[PDB]
Symmetry: D2
């Protein structure tokens, strides 16, 4: 009678993942943990959003501070610093979305089992937890795996696209660039960012080069592409929605129309919901709220010849990924 | 005798105060402390600036992990979290600029004296250290005082303006609004800010109201105006430069031209260098690099009648204030 | 018996007025005129919107040049340059919304009568056309008047609020400042703006002072406030939603709480739908899509004393105003 | 022997080309024509600049209705819309910089000859006028040619880089993406752009795909690369400075250091002043004011293998190109 989940962290991803859950027919958000945000503040951060509008699918109210009330449905609020000490079981949380960004290691993420959780989905890349991307390798998941990663929003955009191109034409080698919206790790004015100097510069007033592991990660969820793709990123002054610029040399000659038709078929086929196809004069804000992992922009791309082409795919880095987090949990729950 | 100074907190103000000092002929930066910026990283943060251009007055290089080197002149660097552990004396710093934003209390600021500093200038309002605004009340400083506040950039903008208006026409009551550039305390995307919820919302994508005691503070540096002013602020999507919007009722009736003439005369005389006067169609970016504390915009303001008007004054919140920090030190150094 | 209307000029206001109309059970959009945008292009500009989202209420298709289909309801498309040649009567448009901005003079707006339109509502201030603001003086409208002005968005925000404060406490004098979103008359980079030099400077990279007659205009819809209000504006880098900052001196002493309760009551009574009331820590994006003309922000304002206060009220300059254009038409149609 | 030049079109390029000329020792600006800017307004537009700061090299005063006076140097101001009518010879303008963007056709730019100018340099690509890029093919120019094109800023950034990579390793094929700053042709809010629908969308609130022939154009100035390059662009929310992202398959295997070394050598030799070389963590604003045509960012790019790599080169789309316009002129004067 519904998949019970808990969310650790309540940032951009934790909050939007909660929105998706609270509005679904099959998943139940039973608890959220966040040591830094009072119960009162939590309701405010959840209700109002600069990018995705006011939550209006249900009204919000405080039952008693250890408790939230979303349209008569309860949601426990924990304020526990040690994951190892979150009583997920007391709330009935089967799955836990680890979305804080500091427990991405399998052994650190594993802490949630201590409190009675049975499954943990890391909402970010992981060095040792298996990564799964819907539409790409989610079928590789098996019930004995308790800690998994849903990879990154960028890998979720690149992988489906690369799979379609590789399966149809054979990818020899490819280089990728993402023109990315700013994020929470960036700064409003030039500030300290010791692990990424460029990343400390005023975010909304600069084009900021940045490294990316999304292309390399593709090789993990699609071994056949390991070592054949790499890339980088440019952080630009936008609040949300990013775009993937994939330049690849393919083995089988294909006209631009053939490539377009392949992506189109896939988007109408088994990858519906994951890959989208568009042929209109759209821009970034037209994709805010789009739940797909990768929306191919047919008119934006360009081919030099039948074996070397540049492909463009949009992605609401916040909302698409958030839906995939729930999508991954759904697949896991259906796997005996 | 060259005034020797140290800086605690190498941020927007710390770094710019460094630029003013390094370009002067009377002040010598001898050391800098910031546990979040290694020596190497410091050369990069000081050299490149999103708003104030590249440093091109002298070369910037590292002598060793503990000393910089600005065109041959040595500047020692520390990485200490607790002020009372900073050996200011060893470096010969007589004056210490407290610009971290977390040690504004007098007793927290006085930690610097333990290490051998003789004077501390807090680059922000202080709860108990006396506040001074150059051109308004710096002459109240007495040498028995070791810890002082240079107030806020906003008070530095409004106070000189109010002084001229009060001395010439007599202020009965006033209400101020500052349309303010974003700062380091804000967030790139909707994030937590437990003590200022609005302040946590995506900075460059919202007009964000905020309270400020900067107007009320004018009453502290000009007691005659106690209880006569207050106001608020709107943080808007710009990287630097803000503006004061003062709606005031005056006792002696005066035409707008009479008010303009009073300010122009003040800018050319007693308050030259503090209050500036312009009569052109300028906009925020035109004031980047302006060293004055308050630049009156003749054409922007409007009078309802001879005793009720709206006055407009610009200020490069980063640069003007940074210069006033040095000016305050110059004045204290000349005292006695 | 729907109210049939036509729209001249398919811009920010024209398109959004069309959205309000198309969503109503009230009025029927029967025709649109714009010689600067093809019929096919028109469907694109109407469908996608950077700030108000994609139109998904009904399907959008082209029937045959000159004819759009929003679901199963036809909308005639004109491409006439001269207003006196638009055969509004052919499409059956009784009311014409003059939203081009270049035909605000009463004589120039009268051209629509030539084509058979019965009434014209200028979606802008007019030098001589009778001005009406809903919730303020729309009851002054008489059926013998065929050309009216719906004022500006700023006056629709300021006037209702002012009426509430004046009737309860008596406004002696006030000065208004509006922190305003950028608009179509502004420029992306420094360019030519002959009648407004500041307004030619890069829009999203500057705080830009501007003159406004919105405060003075209040005197036309509220005689007792004529000559008692004036102000100016600051255009800031946001795409939509602006805020009014009203500093007023009142006759009757009143605590800030009394002022608040007065506005809340009004927002709950006759002025419901025109004046809004909020007391949460909201920011501009939180008001995107708000249909009210003026949303009083309880927590943002501040009082110096019981007779001198600063009040702040938000307004989606695009959406609220567009709804008011339809509300005025609704009132005119219900008038003897 | 001062090279006397005139400028048609006092926009971003015209005004900055003006600044270069006026700060030079070998070029003399003797006349400017722009019927959309009065002599008085012209002084304001030239003096203040959102991106490049206030003009300070010289005073700027008005010597009657036509002549401006810059540091005692008189400059005649014309206000004529039809090129065929500008009396260049009267001012002594030998070379005319055609920077209006509406006379790029050889035949149309030729109009300046009837007025007495002897040479015309089009500050934009031309469909038929011969194009030249300094450091790449300006030596192909011959005195019998009176109308030339300085191509586009993007081609000026990509061409030098392509030349180096091609001369050193051999370019088999390449695909380019430019992350470009907004420009004068874009819109502040969703407005009409019939020839480029995406380009009509709010410029500073969207990532906007854009077509470009800049890469294909490298084939015109570098015949060996004809048909070997193409690409596209993404317009993003910055005021100035853009970047080229070149993905290339090369013939001679070369490690990234060998490539970095080749470019660095070029930047210190034959292409000094044209190609720059950086090895620091820079961001867009760090390049404002850089006069090079293409500045290679060693750390931003990445290599997949010794024959497939992604190269990054910055360019101040306004300043770099403006300097090149003058350089093309200097070359033409020296090869007369
Ligand atoms: N578009 C995106 O933002 C995006 C896309 C894909 C993946 N992600 C992933 O999600 C993470 C980023 O979230 P951010 O926007 O993107 O969201 P935020 O919006 O950065 O998340 C903020 C929340 O994390 C909470 N938090 C911090 N420490 C905590 C702790 N110890 N326990 C509980 N809660 C804690 C904070 O209080 C805050 O409410 C990243 O690690 C990234 O891998 C983000
Ligand atoms: N325009 C302005 O930003 C402006 C104007 C007037 C006054 N101020 C005042 O300046 C502050 C100055 O902040 P910035 O200077 O604006 O913000 P920053 O730019 O956020 O200050 C940055 C630096 O303080 C350093 N720091 C933090 N903790 C420290 C510690 N324990 N020891 C040493 N260094 C430490 C940080 O590492 C960082 O480098 C505030 O308190 C404010 O009221 C700022
Ligand atoms: N926030 C706001 O933008 C706002 C608020 C209140 C009132 N208004 C009013 O609406 C008008 C401004 O609209 P703008 O954004 O604000 O919208 P735009 O978005 O400026 O309107 C643009 C359209 O007007 C069309 N147009 C021009 N000349 C025409 C003609 N002769 N015939 C038919 N169509 C023509 C153009 O082609 C274009 O499509 C102003 O006059 C103002 O009074 C605007
Ligand atoms: N960064 C850049 O913007 C950049 C870089 C390289 C090349 N370019 C190129 O040059 C234009 C550069 O134009 P800009 O951005 O400098 O222009 P702006 O900045 O749009 O140019 C503006 C001026 O041209 C003037 N003008 C228009 N019509 C005229 C006429 N008939 N006679 C005289 N003056 C007239 C206008 O008044 C306006 O002041 C383009 O054609 C483009 O290809 C631009």
């Amino acid at each position: 009678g519904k998949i019970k989940i808990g969310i650790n962290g309540f940032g951009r991803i934790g909050r939007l993942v909660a929105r998706v859950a609270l509005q679904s027919e099959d998943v139940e958000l039973v608890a959220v943990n966040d040591p830094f945000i009072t119960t009162d503040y939590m309701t405010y951060m959840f209700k109002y959003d600069t990018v995705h509008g006011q939550w209006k699918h249900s009204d919000i109210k405080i039952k008693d501070s250890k408790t939230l009330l979303l349209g008569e449905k309860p949601v426990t609020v924990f304020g526990i610093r040690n994951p190892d000490e979150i009583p997920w079981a007391e709330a009935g949380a089967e799955y836990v979305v680890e979305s804080t960004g500091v427990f991405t290691d399998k052994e650190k993420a594993a802490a949630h089992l201590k409190g009675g959780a049975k499954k943990v989905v890391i909402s970010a890349p992981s060095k040792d937890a298996p990564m799964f991307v819907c539409g790409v390798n989610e079928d590789k998941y098996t019930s004995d795996i308790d800690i998994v990663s849903n990879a990154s929003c960028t890998t979720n955009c690149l992988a489906p696209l690369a799979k379609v191109i590789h399966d149809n034409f054979g990818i020899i080698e490819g280089l990728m660039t993402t023109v990315h919206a700013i994020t929470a790790t960036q700064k409003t004015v030039d500030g300290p960012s010791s692990k990424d100097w460029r990343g400390g510069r005023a975010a909304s007033f600069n084009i900021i080069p940045s490294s990316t592991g999304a292309a390399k990660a593709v090789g993990k969820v699609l071994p056949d592409l390991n070592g054949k793709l790499t890339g980088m990123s440019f952080r630009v002054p936008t609040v949300d929605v990013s775009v993937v610029d994939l330049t690849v040399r393919i083995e089988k000659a294909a006209s631009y129309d053939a490539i377009k038709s392949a992506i189109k078929s896939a988007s109408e086929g088994k990858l519906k919901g994951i890959i989208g196809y568009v042929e209109e004069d759209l821009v970034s804000t037209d994709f805010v709220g789009d739940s797909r992992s990768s929306i191919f922009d047919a008119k934006a791309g360009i081919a030099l010849n039948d074996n070397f082409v540049k492909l463009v795919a949009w992605y609401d880095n916040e909302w698409g990924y958030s839906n995939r987090v729930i999508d991954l949990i759904r697949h896991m729950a259906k796997t005996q």
